[PDB]
Design a protein around this ligand. Structure first.
Ligand SMILES: Nc1nc2c(ncn2[C@@H]2CN(C(=O)CCP(=O)(O)O)C[C@H]2OC[C@@H](O)P(=O)(O)O)c(=O)[nH]1
Ligand SMILES: Nc1nc2c(ncn2[C@@H]2CN(C(=O)CCP(=O)(O)O)C[C@H]2OC[C@@H](O)P(=O)(O)O)c(=O)[nH]1
Ligand SMILES: Nc1nc2c(ncn2[C@@H]2CN(C(=O)CCP(=O)(O)O)C[C@H]2OC[C@@H](O)P(=O)(O)O)c(=O)[nH]1
Ligand SMILES: Nc1nc2c(ncn2[C@@H]2CN(C(=O)CCP(=O)(O)O)C[C@H]2OC[C@@H](O)P(=O)(O)O)c(=O)[nH]1
Ligand SMILES: [Mg+2]
Ligand SMILES: [Mg+2]
Ligand SMILES: [Mg+2]
Ligand SMILES: [Mg+2]
Ligand SMILES: [Mg+2]
Ligand SMILES: [Mg+2]
Ligand SMILES: [Mg+2]
Ligand SMILES: [Mg+2]
Lengths: 205, 206, 202, 204
C-alpha cells in the first residue's frame, strides 16, 4: 500500500482541540497527523514487518535524528508481538547518522551480513538519501534489506524510490513534530504539525 | 466548542491500514475515528474538565455500558494530571444503567451527588432525550454543579436541542460502533470507532 | 499445577511514596506504594495471554464485578483485544457488568465462555455466591480472574482461575480498590496510613 | 537526593513465567529483576524531578547510545506529557552520542549557555560519566546534569554520583530495556539477569 494517504487539500486540525506544549503555541499552523493516529498506523506496520522479516535475525537500523521516535515506537510494537506470540526472532539494534553522503557512527556494517536489515526513517522526500544508504548496505550482503518510513512526500523531485513500509503519504508540505525538526526545534512534540510563519521566522537559522 | 468536527462527506479509513480483529473483518466498512485520535482528544478533554470542575470533589458517573471505555480513559488522563500537578482534588466514581422520573439502575443513593461536582460520562448524544431527563433528576439532589462529557455528539434533526458541556467529536447521522459502542452487544471489543457494513448489519441483527 | 500469581511476602516493605508520582490529595493518607501500577500492567499482560490460551476457543463474555473490578477489567480487556487484532486468529467478545449478598438480566452468559473479573478475593464467599448464580444461566464455561488474592485464615478455599498477585492479610487501596469510596482514583495499589484511615473513616 | 529506588543485594527478582517474555530468550534469562512497568512508574517521577530543576531554560537532552535509547525515549515522553498539560513549558532539543572520543553528535558549541541533560542506562565505575562531563564542561553549559536509569553499588566506583537515578542495584550484570549482552537482550522490555546458558549462548 502507499500507506494512509493524506490529500493535498487536507486542512488538518485546530490546535485548540488538542494538548499542545505552550512554547510552540504560536509556532504551529495546524495539527496534521495526531500522535495517536501515528501509533495506530505504526501498530499495523509492526505486524507487516514481522510478516515479511520475522523469519530470521532482524537488525533494526535507526536513521538519526529524525528517525528516533518512529524507531522506538515501531520496535516497541514489534517487541509486543514477539512476547505474545509463539514464534519470535532475535532483534539487535544500531543507529546511524548521515552527513556527498557518508555514514556517521554505527557498528561495523559487517554486522549486517546474513541478517534481515530494517532501515527506519522519518521521511522520504527525494529518495536520494535512501538510494545512497541502500547501495552501501547491500555491499555487506544482508539476507534482506527493507526500509520503513513514517512519511512519504508526494513531490516532483522524487527520483522514483519507494520504501517497503509506509506510515503516511503526505502532500509537498513542510511538517514538524514526532522527532521531525526545523533547525533542531519541534522534535519535542508528539503530533506531526505544519509550522506557521511566526514559527518559521522565530527558529530561522 | 462543538469538538472535533467530522463532516458528512468524510470517507474514513480503509480497514487494511489498521490492526482489526479478524472476526470483524467483513462486518465493518471503514474506520471512522481511530483509537489513537480518540485518545489525543480525550487527553485534551481531561484538562478542560479539571479546569472547570477541579475546584471541588468530583463524583464521576459512568453511563453503562457504552460509556465504560471513554470513562476509563478520561479518568486515566485526569489521574495523570492530578499526580503531576501541585493542586489536586479527590474523585469518587459510580456506574449506572438508564431506562415520571428516568430510572437509574445499579448506582449508589443519589444523595451521594449532593454538594459535589458531578460529571456524567457518556459514549454518545443522539436525540439528547436520555441526558435531558437524567439532568432533571440529578438537579433535585442539589449537586454543587452538574456537567456532561460525551465522546460523541450526532448532528441530527431528531435532536431535542441538548448540548453537552464537553464533547470529543461531532459526527454525522450515521450508526457507528466500536470503543464500547455496540450493535446488539457486538463491536464493543473494538478499539476504533467504525461504521458497520450491510453484511455485518445482517449477521448481528436481532 | 496453575500459577498462584505473583507472591507478595508478609514482610514486603513496599516503596517510599516520594519515589513515585502520587496525587497530592492523598499524600498524607498513604503509607507506602505496595504494588506499582506498571507492575500491575505487566502481570495483567501475561494474564491476558493465559486467558486466551484457556478460553479463546469460543465466544467470551467478560463479566465485570463493580465497583472495584472496573480498572482491572478495562485493562485486562485491552490486553485481550490487542491479542485478538495482532493475529490471524480471534474470537468475538461481549461485555457485561454486575454489582454486589445481593445482585444489581444475565441471558448474555448462556452458551458462552464466561470470564468473571474481580479486584480481590478475601474470604471467597462473594465469588462462591456469584458462581452459583452464574451457572444457572447455563454458560459453556466459567472462569474467574482476580487481580488480588489475600492469604487469610477466613478463606473458604475458593481459588480463582487467574490471579495477578497473592498478598498478605493487609488492607490495600488503589487501582479502583476503595476505602469508603476513596482511593479509587489512584493508579498504584497502596497501604493506607493511620491518617487516611481516620480521615476517610465512616 | 534521592538514591533512587533501592534494590537490595538479596533481591530475589521474579519468576519468568509470571510475565510476558520473548520466547527466543526463554532459557537465556534467570529472573525478571525490574519489571518494565516499574521502570515506567519511576521514570514518570524522574521526569517531574528533571523539570523542577532544569525547566527554567532551554534543555539539550543528550542520549548516550546505545543502551540509553529506551530510557531516553520514555523519559522525554513523560517530560513532553508534562509540557503539554502544564501552563508553561520550555523547548527541548536532542542529540545522540556514542562513546569509544564522542561520535555522531552535534558540535559541542551547541551546548554553550544551555541546560544540558545527559541520559544514561547505567553508572558502574562512573569513569565514563566523569569523562563525558569533563568534555562538556569545556563548552560552558548554563548547567549540566546527569540522569541514569541504574546506578550499581560497587567498590569500583570512583565516587561520581548522578543527579537523577532510577534504581540503585547490586553489583550484578543485568540486561533488557536496551541494556545488552554482546548486543543481545536490547529487544527485551524488562530488566533481567542472564542465566548461565544465556551467557554461554551469546558469548562473544
Ligand atoms: N522536519 C522535516 N524534515 C524533512 C521534510 N522533508 C524532508 N525532510 C528532511 C530534512 N532532513 C534532515 O533534516 C536530515 C537530518 P535529521 O533531522 O537529524 O533527521 C532530511 C530530509 O528527509 C528526506 C531526505 O532524506 P531525501 O530527500 O534524500 O529523501 C519535512 O517536511 N519536514
Ligand atoms: N452503537 C451506537 N449507539 C447509538 C448510536 N446513536 C445512539 N445510540 C445509542 C443506543 N443506545 C444504547 O444502546 C443504550 C445502552 P448501552 O449500549 O449499554 O450504552 C443509546 C443511544 O444513545 C443516545 C441516547 O442516549 P439519546 O438519543 O437519548 O441521546 C450510534 O450511532 N451507535
Ligand atoms: N479496598 C479493599 N477492599 C477489600 C480488601 N479485602 C477485602 N475487600 C473487599 C471489600 N469489598 C467491597 O467493598 C465490595 C464492594 P466494591 O468496592 O464496590 O467492589 C469486597 C471485599 O472483597 C472480597 C470479598 O468479595 P470476599 O471476602 O467474599 O472474597 C482490601 O484489602 N482492600
Ligand atoms: N548490559 C549491562 N551493561 C553494563 C552493566 N554495568 C555496566 N555496563 C556497561 C557496559 N557498557 C557498554 O556496553 C557501552 C556500550 P552500549 O551497550 O551501546 O551502551 C558501559 C557500561 O556502563 C557503565 C560505564 O559507563 P562506567 O563503568 O564508566 O560507569 C550491566 O550490569 N549490564
Ligand atoms: Mg530522516
Ligand atoms: Mg532535520
Ligand atoms: Mg450511552
Ligand atoms: Mg448500545
Ligand atoms: Mg470486588
Ligand atoms: Mg469497596
Ligand atoms: Mg551507557
Ligand atoms: Mg553494552
Amino acid at each position: 500500500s502507499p500507506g494512509v494517504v493524506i490529500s493535498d487539500d487536507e486542512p488538518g486540525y485546530d490546535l485548540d482541540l488538542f494538548a499542545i506544549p505552550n512554547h510552540y503555541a504560536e509556532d504551529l499552523e495546524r495539527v496534521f497527523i495526531p500522535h495517536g493516529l501515528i501509533m495506530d498506523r505504526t501498530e499495523r506496520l509492526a505486524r507487516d514487518v514481522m510478516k515479511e522479516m520475522g523469519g530470521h535475525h532482524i537488525v533494526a537500523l535507526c536513521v538519526l535524528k529524525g528517525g528516533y521516535k518512529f524507531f522506538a515506537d515501531l520496535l516497541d510494537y514489534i517487541k509486543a508481538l514477539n512476547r505474545n506470540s509463539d514464534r519470535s526472532i532475535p532483534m539487535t539494534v544500531d543507529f546511524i547518522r548521515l552527513k556527498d553522503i557518508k555514514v556517521i557512527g554505527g557498528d561495523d556494517l559487517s554486522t549486517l551480513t546474513g541478517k534481515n536489515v530494517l532501515i527506519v526513517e522519518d521521511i522520504i522526500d527525494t529518495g536520494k538519501t535512501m538510494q545512497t544508504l541502500l547501495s552501501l548496505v547491500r555491499q555487506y550482503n544482508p539476507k534482506m534489506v527493507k526500509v520503513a518510513s513514517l512519511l512519504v512526500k508526494r513531490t516532483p523531485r522524487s527520483v522514483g524510490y519507494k520504501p517497503d513500509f509506509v506510515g503516511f503519504e503526505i502532500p509537498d508540505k513542510f511538517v514538524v513534530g514526532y522527532a521531525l525538526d526545523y533547525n533542531e526545534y519541534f522534535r519535542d512534540l508528539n503530533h506531526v504539525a505544519v509550522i506557521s510563519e511566526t514559527g518559521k521566522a522565530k527558529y530561522k537559522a
